[PDB]
Amino acid sequence: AEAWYNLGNAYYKQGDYDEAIEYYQKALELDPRSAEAWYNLGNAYYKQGDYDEAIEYYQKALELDPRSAEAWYNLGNAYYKQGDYDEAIEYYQKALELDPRSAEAWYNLGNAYYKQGDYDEAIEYYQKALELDPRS
Ligand SMILES: [Ca+2]
Ligand SMILES: [Ca+2]
Ligand SMILES: [Ca+2]
Ligand SMILES: [Ca+2]
Ligand SMILES: [Ca+2]
Ligand SMILES: [Ca+2]
Numbered sequence: 001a002e003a004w005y006n007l008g009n010a011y012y013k014q015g016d017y018d019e020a021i022e023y024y025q026k027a028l029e030l031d032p033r034s035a036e037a038w039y040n041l042g043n044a045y046y047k048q049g050d051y052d053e054a055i056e057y058y059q060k061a062l063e064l065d066p067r068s069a070e071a072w073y074n075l076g077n078a079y080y081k082q083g084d085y086d087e088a089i090e091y092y093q094k095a096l097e098l099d100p101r102s103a104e105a106w107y108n109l110g111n112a113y114y115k116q117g118d119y120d121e122a123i124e125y126y127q128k129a130l131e132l133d134p135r136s
Contacts, residue, residue, distance in 0.1 A: 001031030025041070034064075046081075058075040062075070076088040
């Protein structure tokens with residue numbers, strides 16, 4: 001499974017998402033417990049704009065590695081990109097429980113409240129992000 005996975009990765013890194021998907025599927029045939037292959041299959045679908053499918057695969061990754069702050073954050077992002085800001089909030093909160101020093105997750109939580117039109121909550125979360133990383 002690991003060799004098919006790394007071939008998929010090489011195709012992903014050169015922007016060839018169709019090929020990445022084919023080789024992650026082959027990895028998952030050989031090892032259905034690869035949280036990494038489910039996650040990167042999600043990412044490949046995310047890059048194609050296929051957020052519905054990205055969410056399915058991130059959920060499978062999180063069944064195997066529920067302590068994946070990465071999968072929780074990208075699951076949030078897949079809802080954010082669809083305009084599903086209240087769903088994004090739930091998954092960003094889960095990412096931040098696992099990694100409370102993620103400036104990214106605090107910032108995107110603030111963005112989700114901003115998009116909901118809750119500016120006072122956006123301010124609170126942006127202030128927390130900027131406390132962690134004041135350079136953006
Ligand atoms: Ca659909
Ligand atoms: Ca849909
Ligand atoms: Ca489809
Ligand atoms: Ca983890
Ligand atoms: Ca949608
Ligand atoms: Ca909603």
